[PDB]
Amino acid sequence: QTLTYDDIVGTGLANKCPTLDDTARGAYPIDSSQTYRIARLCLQPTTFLVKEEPKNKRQEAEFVPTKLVTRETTSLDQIQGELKVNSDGSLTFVEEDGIDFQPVTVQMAGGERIPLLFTVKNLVASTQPNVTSITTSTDFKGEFNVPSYRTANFLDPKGRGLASGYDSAIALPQAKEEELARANVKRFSLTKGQISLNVAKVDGRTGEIAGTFESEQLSDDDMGAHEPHEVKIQGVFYASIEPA
Amino acid sequence: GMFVLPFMARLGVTGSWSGWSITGETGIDPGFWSFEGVALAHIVLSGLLFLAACWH
Amino acid sequence: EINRRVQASLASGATLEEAWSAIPEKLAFYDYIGNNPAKGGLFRTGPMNKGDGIAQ
Amino acid sequence: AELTPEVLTVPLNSEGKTITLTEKQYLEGKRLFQYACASCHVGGITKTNPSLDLRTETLALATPPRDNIEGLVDYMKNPTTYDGEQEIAEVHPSLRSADIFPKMRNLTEKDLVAIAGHILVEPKILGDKWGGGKVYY
Amino acid sequence: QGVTVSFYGGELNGQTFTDPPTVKSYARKAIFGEIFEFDTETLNSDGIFRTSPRGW
Amino acid sequence: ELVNVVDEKLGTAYGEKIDLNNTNIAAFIQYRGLYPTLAKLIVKNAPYESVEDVLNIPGLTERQKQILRENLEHFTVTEVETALVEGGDRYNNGLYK
Ligand code: CLA
Numbered sequence: 001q002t003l004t005y006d007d008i009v010g011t012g013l014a015n016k017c018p019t020l021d022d023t024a025r026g027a028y029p030i031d032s033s034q035t036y037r038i039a040r041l042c043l044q045p046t047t048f049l050v051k052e053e054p055k056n057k058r059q060e061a062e063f064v065p066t067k068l069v070t071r072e073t074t075s076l077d078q079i080q081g082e083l084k085v086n087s088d089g090s091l092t093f094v095e096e097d098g099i100d101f102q103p104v105t106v107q108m109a110g111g112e113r114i115p116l117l118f119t120v121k122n123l124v125a126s127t128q129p130n131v132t133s134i135t136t137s138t139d140f141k142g143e144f145n146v147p148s149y150r151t152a153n154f155l156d157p158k159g160r161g162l163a164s165g166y167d168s169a170i171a172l173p174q175a176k177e178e179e180l181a182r183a184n185v186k187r188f189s190l191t192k193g194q195i196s197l198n199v200a201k202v203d204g205r206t207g208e209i210a211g212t213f214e215s216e217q218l219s220d221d222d223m224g225a226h227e228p229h230e231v232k233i234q235g236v237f238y239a240s241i242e243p244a
Numbered sequence: 245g246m247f248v249l250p251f252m253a254r255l256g257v258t259g260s261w262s263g264w265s266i267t268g269e270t271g272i273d274p275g276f277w278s279f280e281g282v283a284l285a286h287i288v289l290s291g292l293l294f295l296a297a298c299w300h
Numbered sequence: 301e302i303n304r305r306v307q308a309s310l311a312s313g314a315t316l317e318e319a320w321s322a323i324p325e326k327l328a329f330y331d332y333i334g335n336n337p338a339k340g341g342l343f344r345t346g347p348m349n350k351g352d353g354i355a356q
Numbered sequence: 357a358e359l360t361p362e363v364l365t366v367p368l369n370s371e372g373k374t375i376t377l378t379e380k381q382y383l384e385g386k387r388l389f390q391y392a393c394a395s396c397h398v399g400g401i402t403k404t405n406p407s408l409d410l411r412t413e414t415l416a417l418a419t420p421p422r423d424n425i426e427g428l429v430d431y432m433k434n435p436t437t438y439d440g441e442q443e444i445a446e447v448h449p450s451l452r453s454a455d456i457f458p459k460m461r462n463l464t465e466k467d468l469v470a471i472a473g474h475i476l477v478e479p480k481i482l483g484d485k486w487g488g489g490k491v492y493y
Numbered sequence: 494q495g496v497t498v499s500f501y502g503g504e505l506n507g508q509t510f511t512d513p514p515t516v517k518s519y520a521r522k523a524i525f526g527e528i529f530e531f532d533t534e535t536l537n538s539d540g541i542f543r544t545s546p547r548g549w
Numbered sequence: 550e551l552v553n554v555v556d557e558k559l560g561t562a563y564g565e566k567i568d569l570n571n572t573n574i575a576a577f578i579q580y581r582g583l584y585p586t587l588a589k590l591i592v593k594n595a596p597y598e599s600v601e602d603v604l605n606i607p608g609l610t611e612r613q614k615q616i617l618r619e620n621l622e623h624f625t626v627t628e629v630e631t632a633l634v635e636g637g638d639r640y641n642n643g644l645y646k
Pocket residue numbers: 342343344345346347545546549
């Protein structure tokens with residue numbers, strides 16, 4: 001009747017967001033009096049693209065395909081937060097909590113590995129004005145925080161770190177330190193990402209929405225040791241709306 | 245300074261198992277007959293010929 | 301020996317700058333672990349200058 | 357060095373009254389501490405919550421103060437969080453929760469005093485090693 | 494702890510450093526004893542101690 | 550240029566007192582009555598423009614308010630440091646005994 005953990009375990013389904021069937025083309029009424037919230041937000045990436053970095057800036061850099069090497073470990077889920085109604089009828093989702101990040105490594109043609117913290121941490125996303133009902137026309141656009149892929153305790157292979165670790169290349173006791181400044185002095189990245197959620201299906205009765213998303217964010221900079229890359233993530237999403 | 249790469253490319257071997265092609269494409273699938281597969285085949289051939297030499 | 305000389309200079313009325321400036325370069329250089337023969341490695345080849353550098 | 361009466365003299369209460377433990381009470385304290393407490397509190401640390409240790413200074417700053425026999429005996433009957441705000445008998449071994457922590461079922465008032473005495477005497481012997489963890493091993 | 498470093502004698506005679514990374518940098522050198530300036534470029538020195546002819 | 554922000558933080562009041570905006574929660578154990586109840590509330594309602602603003606946490610009892618007042622001298626505030634507050638590090642900074 002209804003799937004259990006043991007039906008699902010090891011199939012790959014646990015990394016998939018819930019779907020809605022083709023008859024779910026309704027509209028979910030919004031009431032300016034009542035406060036709303038997203039009870040569950042899920043994001044399932046289906047493609048990862050990395051912007052190439054050519055030697056010459058005269059020709060435009062394109063986003064290219066990558067291969068996922070870290071397996072079915074990529075989806076964000078159990079995300080919740082307030083869904084506010086704004087004076088102009090627009091809606092604002094303010095992300096509070098949930099499984100809102102996954103470390104992800106993709107591999108470019110020729111082998112170069114691109115680790116990233118796929119995330120919507122601190123997401124604040126808004127609709128168009130005058131949304132009396134969320135429909136297959138509604139969309140959310142917003143910005144989120146991308147903190148360092150490694151947190152401050154992380155130690156490099158020579159035991160150097162930010163909130164822990166050596167502060168020099170100890171294997172080279174008398175080397176000049178200037179050339180090694182960037183590797184020796186760890187730095188914690190915090191940058192902005194951008195995301196659009198295109199609502200494609202709505203179940204007006206249950207308060208459930210689904211569609212596609214596209215996000216853009218920087219990859220891992222390995223605590224300031226190298227320049228990050230621009231990543232574009234596409235996939236499907238699911239959300240349940242509730243009165244708060 | 246590539247010497248044998250052009251000869252592979254001349255007759256249709258243009259891709260790598262690592263996903264690049266010499267025409268600049270990404271995400272292509274060359275099948276077995278990538279630059280690497282060609283290299284592998286020649287190494288195995290070399291070994292088989294070596295053994296055949298011994299017999300003869 | 302460095303400390304003995306510095307203390308003697310201070311006792312004789314020199315400033316701290318004058319006391320340390322009276323220490324021969326060569327004596328200070330012996331008081332450095334880079335010149336200790338028990339700091340090398342079996343396959344760390346060549347002159348001591350090749351490690352820490354040519355002292356200036 | 358010896359385990360003297362002076363070593364075995366510890367604060368009984370918050371007022372300043374002391375009690376002198378016997379060598380037998382010391383032995384019993386160690387035995388009973390091992391029996392009921394050591395699985396988590398070995399060496400004066402706390403395995404399941406390393407933030408809180410059994411150092412006398414830490415106990416003194418607990419609410420209510422636990423750097424004396426009375427405080428410790430009371431803790432073993434009705435354990436609280438460090439600020440005294442919550443009663444934690446349901447997740448910490450005590451006489452009050454002897455039903456769910458069965459090793460507490462056969463601990464007498466005498467036994468509690470012995471354990472309390474162990475906790476107070478041990479740092480007087482081992483110093484910073486008590487509650488120190490692996491750094492001091 | 495507001496650690497500072499002042500130099501007496503040598504190149505840095507009379508100078509005081511208060512910048513914590515600078516002070517720390519000098520403290521790292523001080524574990525080796527007296528502090529020297531080295532030419533690390535002429536021999537492409539690698540910063541790793543070698544033994545002397547006494548050791549060899 | 551390149552600076553370790555955590556080391557620099559040690560040269561501020563963060564290195565001297567409990568910083569209500571940055572310091573890991575286990576530091577509240579140093580003083581009577583602060584841990585775990587008040588410590589949780591303090592971290593949850595951070596950051597604070599001043600130390601006194603800790604008294605504005607909604608729902609405090611009068612005893613709790615008095616404990617806070619008695620401890621203000623042991624508190625400070627500095628700018629939020631991303632490296633100290635990310636990763637849930639205020640609740641568990643990877644240090645045990
Ligand atoms: C007593 C012997 C001896 C000693 C103590 C020295 C000492 C020194 N030499 Mg001189 N030298 C020697 C003889 C020696 N030399 C000989 C015979 C030659 C002609 C080859 C040279 C030519 C020479 C040159 C060209 C240079 C030196 C240099 C140096 C300095 C650096 C040494 C170094 O890096 O070693 C490195 C030592 C090793 C890497 C260890 C060798 C270990 C071997 C390989 C072990 C072999 C294992 C064996 C195969 C196992 C067998 C197993 C089997 C039985 C089962 C040092 C002052 C350098 C210097 O600074 O010049 C100014 C330099 O450039 N030497």
